[PDB]
Subunit: 126 residues, 4 copies
């Protein structure tokens, strides 16, 4: 897909990462809201905050990875590393409420899946 | 899905609107980039600008519509009206390059589909 | 600033609206976080949700209003109306906690100021 | 500002980084639009693309850095590294058009300033 500098990149891995980022951003926005409406909250504040970060970073990553013109591997690697890191953190935080709140079980799966997609694409941008 | 103030809302129409916004934001980000890489551009500048607006508004609309806690129909109606309006404008602009650039044919379909989803949900929030 | 279609627009009002949107988005992001950390919360859930919507819409509005190329008054009016409406809603919600939480007093002022800037610019785009 | 895990962080450096991210996001959005309207473009396509990435990452970074609740230094470091990297890339790209287009001179200064603010805050999160 387009420039020589993106020669040898897995276009399927790029497509999977973009779809995973958009699904994971929406999952995290939905999960921050679901935790907000739980008669519990108070105990879910780090979870809500991490959901908000994870939605913001997945949104930005989906946009950066969607652009081929004037591709810069340094920018793309740094953005993928940020998204991998926040997805890992948000997956772990949501998994802690997997039994207390069904929304966090589903969101934990979304974060873990997007973490894997970012890591797989990052590993191939050498 | 959650509060009494969202009694009588079509949850399926709400879900379709959220998925359409995320697919249309990514379609418009991809199309701004595709037009940027076209040996043409120069003639595609309004198209690129409208793609950027349409991605920004679809992103915001997907997030607002994903939230049920403390739902406010005035805010939701105003955001859906904005998204309907920009999707209409971006659909028309991309359709003009439908024969010159395949990306704009696909993006025009995305904008028209998301315009319909916003209008259908807006009509039922009375 | 640029096209004939933006002839007769107040460039100072446009600049004030953009700066107000960015200051108000950050104020609302900060206030959602401040309410999240308040030993209270539980009672601040509509406030947090409205802060999140208001940040998302102010962010999108700042970007749309920053663009002059292929200006479309219908899109700009609809986006300003959405931002005015959410700033009004978020200003009212934060003002309710003005005495309980200092963050919401400061955020209420930010929302009211950005509401005024959107309304003033909207009134002149006839 | 709030949790023990943010003990020893420079609150002034945190505030400067947030303001720099919001000013730099708007500078880059404005510069992508300014390059789009330049009778040149064609030659400014990498510049426009990098402006779009830099606006998206600065927007996300401003939001993440605005949140104190459940602070995670790994997430914050990774996001600051991404923002530093894209600001460096966008500063260099805009500087190349500093003499051809006044918008890119002003945007290059914005990118360089925000790069410095991210690097200074990152260095102190050890
Ligand atoms: Cu991704
Ligand atoms: Cu993601
Ligand atoms: Cu997510
Ligand atoms: Cu949640
Ligand atoms: Cu949660
Ligand atoms: Cu959560
Ligand atoms: Cu998450
Ligand atoms: Cu994420
Ligand atoms: Cu991502
Ligand atoms: Cu991620
Ligand atoms: Cu999570
Ligand atoms: Cu959770
Ligand atoms: Cu949860
Ligand atoms: Cu969760
Ligand atoms: Cu998640
Ligand atoms: Cu989550
Ligand atoms: Cu994720
Ligand atoms: Cu996540
Ligand atoms: Cu990912
Ligand atoms: Cu990814
Ligand atoms: Cu939608
Ligand atoms: Cu849409
Ligand atoms: Cu779209
Ligand atoms: Cu396009
Ligand atoms: Cu186009
Ligand atoms: Cu376009
Ligand atoms: Cu579009
Ligand atoms: Cu859109
Ligand atoms: Cu939408
Ligand atoms: Cu739309
Ligand atoms: Cu379009
Ligand atoms: Cu087009
Ligand atoms: Cu096109
Ligand atoms: Cu298009
Ligand atoms: Cu489109
Ligand atoms: Cu389009
Ligand atoms: Cu659309
Ligand atoms: Cu669109
Ligand atoms: Cu829509
Ligand atoms: Cu919609
Ligand atoms: Cu504004
Ligand atoms: Cu605003
Ligand atoms: Cu605000
Ligand atoms: Cu607050
Ligand atoms: Cu609040
Ligand atoms: Cu609030
Ligand atoms: Cu607010
Ligand atoms: Cu706002
Ligand atoms: Cu605004
Ligand atoms: Cu507003
Ligand atoms: Cu508010
Ligand atoms: Cu409040
Ligand atoms: Cu508050
Ligand atoms: Cu508030
Ligand atoms: Cu506010
Ligand atoms: Cu507020
Ligand atoms: Cu506001
Ligand atoms: Cu507000
Ligand atoms: Cu405003
Ligand atoms: Cu405004
Ligand atoms: Cu910053
Ligand atoms: Cu920045
Ligand atoms: Cu910038
Ligand atoms: Cu520029
Ligand atoms: Cu440029
Ligand atoms: Cu540029
Ligand atoms: Cu830039
Ligand atoms: Cu930036
Ligand atoms: Cu930044
Ligand atoms: Cu940056
Ligand atoms: Cu730049
Ligand atoms: Cu440039
Ligand atoms: Cu320029
Ligand atoms: Cu520039
Ligand atoms: Cu810049
Ligand atoms: Cu720039
Ligand atoms: Cu920057
Ligand atoms: Cu920049
Ligand atoms: Cu920075
Ligand atoms: Cu920074």
């Amino acid at each position: 897909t387009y420039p020589a500098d993106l020669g040898g990149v897995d276009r399927e891995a790029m497509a999977r990462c973009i779809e995973e980022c958009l699904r994971c951003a929406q999952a995290c926005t939905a999960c921050a809201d679901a935790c907000l409406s739980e008669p519990t909250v108070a105990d879910l504040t780090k979870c809500i905050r991490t959901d908000m970060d994870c939605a913001d970073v997945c949104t930005a990553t989906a946009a950066v990875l969607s652009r081929h013109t004037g591709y810069d591997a340094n920018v793309t690697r740094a953005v993928l590393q940020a998204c991998a890191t926040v997805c890992a953190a948000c997956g772990d935080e949501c998994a802690r409420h997997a039994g207390m709140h069904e929304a966090c079980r589903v969101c934990a799966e979304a974060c873990r899946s997007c973490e894997q997609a970012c890591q797989e694409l990052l590993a191939g941008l050498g």
